[PDB]
Design a protein around this ligand. Structure first.
Ligand SMILES: OC[C@H]1O[C@@](CO)(O[C@H]2O[C@H](CO)[C@@H](O)[C@H](O)[C@H]2O)[C@@H](O)[C@@H]1O
Ligand SMILES: [Mg+2]
Length: 580
DNA sequence: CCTGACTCG
DNA sequence: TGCGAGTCAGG
């Protein structure tokens, strides 16, 4: 059938009730400076559709949007909030966000539209956005009749679904997780995205020129060593050259043809001088295509800023992700790529970039949750955790720990956090499974509490059907009971890792909320720009650095109280590169 | 659109 | 098979 609603030509009093489901539709996937195609409001008085030009030009409606005492229930309120920010309109009073509610209830559902969330509660009186707008080249806003009913149906679904979603959240002990963590964070992410990060495009272009030169040199050096020209960026063409023309050993047979992955070539390097060059070529090639050309493509022509979008409802562990561009994967590990960060600068003159990061948050969280005496003491002494681990598993004094020993102990710690497995560790350290198993046994002997936790968390996952984080985020693991070893093992590793990675995510999210409250209380001009999993990047007047050096670490370190202290390091400088 | 390469915590 | 993510050239 059809859903009744008023297609209003002007805003009316009854459309401004103090409780309503609100839809401010932005169809463009990237909502920055994007158009709002329509508005829908559902409240105690009825269902309404408003043309944006009319609603957003009405002083009464705008005041309503900005009145924190007028409560709104929405789906992906950040999208609407940011689209409105670009129009100079403030959105306040969002008391419920269906996207975040659904995400917390079950991140694996992949809910990305009202229909998907409603289907969770057997409500299907609303169409999927894709069905209405289509996808790809066929994407398009339907005629008003169609658009209007869709927005109203979405608003009606939100209106109806709020109660049941909140009820289940409460049963899961996630009510505060939504109301006191994710929703307030949503508003903070909106400010960060809207603020954007300034890019020194002239610096990027010059780096681009220099890379084009080096890339040319390496490219020619590769054709020279191969005795012919070919597409180096073609794993297929590359494979023929390496394993056929040059007769290099085939140590890995992937899906189709051969494998020319990083660790495969790293092992082939000793056989021919071409391998090193191919690796370097790929390194520089990625910098050019993605961090030079790709980045320049998304920099706003006028402001020279990039405005990422933090997807707050995607990862299975509670982390955020970043896109167009992804500002959470800018090079830093290799010096040549790290230079890219010199192109990220403060948005105002005489300002600086300030970066604060948690030191070993994952292992500190593990110590807390597993309550391992040895691991908690290590952090209480603020020891170099990898050196300490080597001392324990290899039974040597601190002075006897060699560089190679620390390296392997470090790999063991990663394995432990990721969900330790003979095969996995062996593959990473390039050693036998038995040897890797020996390392693992030694680790558990030194950290019996961690062994206990890994055993218990897997059992708990099987009993309850899910695992939880410090702030009650959850992840269902049905595969934990699979009689297929490989499938079950994936689930077991997830049971071990999710509480760690997820809890670390919970912590920094609270740190961000606490920090913004502090910045506001102090009326500092400093503001957050980015979050990179265990670090927070801000920009501020140079005159605020001394205050930031004390405030940021303290806030981050005190976000939550664990059985071991939380440690935060920080640096600042003229560019992101210099904030080291 | 899919694969395999690279980037990050 | 070690955990969690995104982007791009070639197929
Ligand atoms: O507004 C972000 C919000 O929208 C979703 C859809 O529910 O993702 C859309 O927007 C992202 C940023 O432009 C795209 O990467 C994604 O492809 C598009 O569907 C959510 O995942 C997200 O929380
Ligand atoms: Mg760190």
């Amino acid at each position: 059938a059809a859903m009744a609603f008023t297609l209003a030509d002007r805003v009316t009093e009854e459309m401004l009730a103090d409780k309503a489901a609100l839809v401010v539709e932005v169809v463009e996937e990237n909502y920055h400076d994007a158009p709002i195609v329509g508005i829908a409001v559902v409240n105690e008085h009825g269902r309404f559709f408003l043309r944006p030009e009319t609603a957003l030009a009405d002083p009464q409606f705008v005041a309503w949007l900005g009145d924190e005492t007028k409560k709104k229930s929405m789906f992906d309120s950040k999208r609407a909030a940011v689209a409105l920010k670009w129009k100079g309109i403030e959105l306040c009073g969002v008391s419920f966000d269906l996207l975040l509610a659904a995400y917390l209830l079950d991140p694996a559902q992949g809910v990305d539209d009202v229909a998907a969330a409603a289907k969770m509660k057997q409500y299907e009186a609303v169409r999927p956005d894709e069905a209405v707008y289509g996808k790809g080249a066929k994407r398009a806003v339907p005629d008003e009749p169609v658009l209007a009913e869709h927005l109203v149906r979405k608003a009606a679904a939100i209106w109806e679904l709020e109660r049941p979603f909140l009820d289940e959240l409460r049963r899961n002990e996630q009510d505060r997780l939504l109301v006191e963590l994710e929703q307030p964070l949503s508003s903070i992410l909106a400010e960060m995205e809207f603020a954007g990060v300034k890019v020194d495009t002239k610096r990027l272009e010059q780096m681009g020129k220099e890379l084009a030169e080096q890339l040319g040199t390496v490219e020619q050096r590769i054709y020279e060593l191969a005795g012919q020209e070919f597409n180096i960026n073609s794993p297929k063409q590359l494979g023929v050259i390496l394993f056929e023309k040059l007769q290099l050993p085939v140590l890995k047979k992937t899906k189709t043809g051969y494998s020319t992955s990083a660790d495969v070539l790293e092992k082939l390097a000793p056989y021919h001088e071409i391998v090193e060059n191919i690796l370097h070529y790929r390194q520089l090639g990625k910098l050019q295509s993605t961090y030079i050309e790709g980045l320049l493509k998304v920099v706003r022509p006028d402001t020279k800023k990039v405005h990422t979008i933090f997807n707050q409802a995607l990862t299975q562990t509670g982390r955020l992700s970043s896109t167009e561009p992804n500002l959470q994967n800018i090079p830093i590990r290799l010096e040549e790529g790290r230079k890219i960060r010199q192109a990220f600068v403060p948005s105002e003159s005489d300002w600086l970039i300030f970066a604060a990061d948690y030191s070993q948050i994952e292992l500190r969280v593990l110590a807390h949750i597993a309550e391992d005496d040895n691991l908690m003491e290590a952090f209480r002494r603020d020891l170099d955790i990898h050196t300490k681990t080597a001392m324990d598993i290899f039974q040597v004094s601190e002075d006897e720990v060699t560089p190679n020993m620390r390296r392997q102990a470090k790999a063991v710690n990663f394995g432990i956090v990721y969900g330790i497995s003979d095969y996995g560790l062996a593959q990473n350290l390039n050693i036998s499974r038995k040897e890797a198993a020996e390392f693992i046994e030694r680790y558990f002997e030194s950290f019996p509490g961690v062994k206990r936790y890994m055993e218990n968390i897997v059992q708990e996952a099987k009993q309850k059907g899910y695992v939880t984080t410090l702030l009650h985020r959850r992840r269902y693991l049905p595969d934990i009971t699979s009689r297929n070893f490989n499938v079950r093992s994936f689930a077991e590793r997830m049971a071990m890792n999710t509480p760690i990675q997820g809890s670390a995510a919970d912590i920094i999210k609270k740190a961000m909320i606490d920090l913004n409250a502090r910045l506001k209380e102090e009326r500092l001009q400093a503001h957050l720009l980015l979050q990179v999993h265990d670090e927070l990047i801000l920009e501020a007047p140079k005159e605020e650095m001394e205050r930031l050096c004390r405030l940021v670490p303290e806030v981050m370190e005190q976000a939550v109280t664990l059985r071991v202290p939380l440690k935060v390091d920080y640096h600042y400088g003229s560019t992101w590169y210099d904030a080291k």
